[PDB]
Structure formats: structure tokens, C-alpha cells
């Protein structure tokens, strides 16, 4: 699903403000053509046989 709420890592109540003990769970990849193998983006498809 989609969830953009702010993580509460510590035992401190916070809302809206991001920073210490208020983390954003969504972080992005970075892809450049000069990266090595292992940092290359690999397209993955699976199957759901039953």
C-alpha cells in the first residue's frame, strides 16, 4: 500500500516536523551509468503458479 506518515523511532511524540526521532520511511535509489555491477538496476518479474 501507500503510507507517507512519519516514523516514530524513539519514545518521543512528534508530528509534522521531520528530524530527530521523526523519520521519513521513503528513500530513493540513485542510478548512474558509471556504477558497478550490483548497483545496477535489475528488472525483476515473478510468476504465481498454483
Amino acid at each position, epitope marked *: 500500500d501507500i503510507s507517507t506518515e512519519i516514523y516514530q523511532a524513539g519514545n518521543k511524540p512528534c508530528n509534522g516536523v521531520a528530524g530527530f526521532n521523526c523519520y521519513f520511511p521513503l528513500r530513493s535509489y540513485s542510478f*548512474r*551509468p*558509471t*556504477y*558497478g*555491477v*550490483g548497483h545496477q538496476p535489475y528488472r525483476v518479474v515473478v510468476l504465481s503458479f498454483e
Partner: antibody
Amino acid sequence: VQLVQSGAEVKKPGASVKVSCKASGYTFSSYYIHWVRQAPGQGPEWMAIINPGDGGASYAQKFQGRVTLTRDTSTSTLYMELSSLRSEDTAVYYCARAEGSSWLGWFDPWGQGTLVTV
Amino acid sequence: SVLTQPPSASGTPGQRVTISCSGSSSNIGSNYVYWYQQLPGTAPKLLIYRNNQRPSGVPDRFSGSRSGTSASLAISGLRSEDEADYYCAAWDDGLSGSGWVFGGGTKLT
């Protein structure tokens, strides 16, 4: 429809050396720019690939972070500022042109190069 | 990987020899190769595309091909003007870096 370099000379090791070449000719936003270094008596090593407009940059393993490049559109200048010069950093630089919106394919003609020695 | 090249290429005026670049897996057999010739005192110049056609126009006395993990270029009708250095360029896609790697160095005699 051509590229010419800039003049330079010998500099002290462990300093910053400014290198640049102009760019003119066709449209600018849809042609990637290659720079490549060549050492005398050996084979050349690939330096950088640059996307104009947003100024996208990418660097090789042996030069990641130790070299800095800047680019612009209206003035059409392409700068590197070399730092941490060794005796290995005495070579000739070339600025190039690519296919456009693609970093794979043949290389368009280079300039006259810039020689740097320590 | 490293793209080993012979140190020199012997020849006499008026005959055919082959100059080759031997590479590792996923460097020559994966992507295409590029042949380059460096005339002394001049900027280098492109001579071939992917080895099935000529870029703008050259007489067909030079022929390029691939074999497994290596690339070869057969040259004929050798002249004293064409004595230069030959280079090969390829996309490496190796571990920790995937730059435009080049070959070693050869001299035409």
C-alpha cells in the same frame, strides 16, 4: 561546429588547475558531452560524461570525487578544476560530443586537447 | 576488464596483417567495439562504427570482425603513411566501475 581548448602551463603539485573548452555548432540541450584524458606513450582513459541543461554528471572509479566539473548553457562553458595533482596527472585532456540523449555509440570529433604537467 | 593488446604490429608496404584486441567476458561479447587510429601530431579520428558498415566512407581494404571475446581488424595495401597506433574502445560493465575502457598499445611497422 567545432571545439577549441584553452591555454595552460605547468603548475605546482597539490593545487587546483582550471581547464575549459568552448562549445558551438548545433543545438545544445539534446547532445551529451564526453571528456577523455590521454597519456603520452599509453592508452587514453575515459574521464566524464555530462548532460547539458540540468547539468547531469557522472565520473569513473579512479576519479570519483577527486575532480570537479561545472557546466552551463547560455555562456556555453565546460569547466573542470583539478585538485591533488600527482605525476600521474600529467596528460592531455579532450572534450567531445556524443549521439544525443544516449551515452552509448560512436564518438564525435574531439578538440586539440590541453596538456597538463606537474 | 583490461583489454590486452599486442605491443606492436609488424608489416611491410603492400600486404595484409590483422590487429586484434582480446578481452574478457561481458566486455567484447556483450557490447560492440570501436577501432581508432592515432596519426602523429593530429587529433584522433573515427574510422569504423559497429563492424558491419563504414561510417561515412573509406575504401573497403580494411575489414573488421568479432570472434568470441575478441575483435579483429585486417588491413591490406599497407603504406608508409598509415604507420600509426591502433586502439580499441569498449563498454566494460565490470564490478565497481563500468567506464569506456580502452585497450593496450600497438605500433604499426
